[PDB]
Amino acid sequence: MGQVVQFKLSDIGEGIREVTVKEWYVKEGDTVSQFDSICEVQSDKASVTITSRYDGVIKKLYYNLDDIAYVGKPLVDIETEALKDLE
């Protein structure tokens, strides 16, 4: 209690092509829900979608449906219940 979990582009390797967001359903300072996913990226390989499984608070967002995210650096910070996903 008192910490936020950050999402980092990891759909690809840490030294290859990057990927952009295909579906965005959140905004800076906005809250997420179990049905309201944060971001979703789609690559020729497979379609990735980031769910929440709970209602979390999103404070800042930099990459949009058009911006490409790179592996190795976080993308957005959101507050969600303890999830093994990142911790």
From Swiss-Prot:
Compartment list: Mitochondrion matrix
Domain of life: Eukaryota
Residues of the Lipoyl-binding domain: 4-79
Residues found modified as N6-succinyllysine: 73
Residue numbers carrying N6-lipoyllysine: 45
Known role: The branched-chain alpha-keto dehydrogenase complex catalyzes the overall conversion of alpha-keto acids to acyl-CoA and CO(2). It contains multiple copies of three enzymatic components: branched-chain alpha-keto acid decarboxylase (E1), lipoamide acyltransferase (E2) and lipoamide dehydrogenase (E3). Within this complex, the catalytic function of this enzyme is to accept, and to transfer to coenzyme A, acyl groups that are generated by the branched-chain alpha-keto acid decarboxylase component.
Involvement in disease: Patients with primary biliary cirrhosis (PBC) show autoantibodies against the E2 component of branched-chain alpha-keto acid dehydrogenase complex. PBC is a chronic, progressive cholestatic liver disease characterized by the presence of antimitochondrial autoantibodies in patients serum. It manifests with inflammatory obliteration of intra-hepatic bile duct, leading to liver cell damage and cirrhosis. Maple syrup urine disease 2: A form of maple syrup urine disease, an autosomal recessive metabolic disorder due to an enzyme defect in the catabolic pathway of the branched-chain amino acids leucine, isoleucine, and valine. Accumulation of these 3 amino acids and their corresponding keto acids leads to encephalopathy and progressive neurodegeneration. Clinical features include mental and physical retardation, feeding problems, and a maple syrup odor to the urine. The keto acids of the branched-chain amino acids are present in the urine.
The family this protein is said to belong to: Belongs to the 2-oxoacid dehydrogenase family.
Subunit structure: Forms a 24-polypeptide structural core with octahedral symmetry that represents the E2 component of the branched-chain alpha-ketoacid dehydrogenase (BCKDH) complex. The BCKDH complex is composed of three major building blocks E1, E2 and E3. It is organized around E2, a 24-meric cubic core composed of DBT, to which are associated 6 to 12 copies of E1, and approximately 6 copies of the dehydrogenase E3, a DLD dimer.
Protein's name in the database: Lipoamide acyltransferase component of branched-chain alpha-keto acid dehydrogenase complex, mitochondrial
Species this protein is from: Homo sapiens
Taxonomic classification: Eukaryota, Metazoa, Chordata, Craniata, Vertebrata
